[PDB]
């Protein structure tokens, strides 16, 4: 059924303070290894 009389973006009413951070923490498993510049820091 085609419905355009309702707002479907109602999920953000239940977001907490840490939601972005736990989303990133759960996403951390799928991500690929990062490239390295060869040193720990530019000050090293």
């Amino acid at each position: 059924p085609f419905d355009n009389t309702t707002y479907k973006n109602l999920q953000h009413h239940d977001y907490s303070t840490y939601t972005f951070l736990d989303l990133n923490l759960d996403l951390s498993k799928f991500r690929m290894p990062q490239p390295s510049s060869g040193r720990e820091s530019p000050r090293h």
Partner: protein
């Protein structure tokens, strides 16, 4: 308490365009002289992109 002196050559500063003119003027007037060579700054290698190097120590911590 003023500064008193007995040296007439205390404020004598002479200007010459090149070194050899100064040498000839000193040798003509009978003054024992010493010569110091001119010190010039050697050229540098300046790069604005070196502040954001990918793997070199020349990164800037701030700007």
């Amino acid at each position: 308490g003023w500064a008193s002196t007995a040296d007439p050559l205390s404020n004598l500063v002479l200007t010459f365009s090149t070194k050899e003119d100064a040498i000839a003027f000193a040798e003509k007037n009978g003054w024992s002289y010493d010569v110091e060579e001119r010190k010039v700054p050697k050229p540098k290698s300046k790069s604005y992109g070196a502040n954001f190097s990918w793997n070199k120590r020349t990164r800037v911590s701030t700007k």
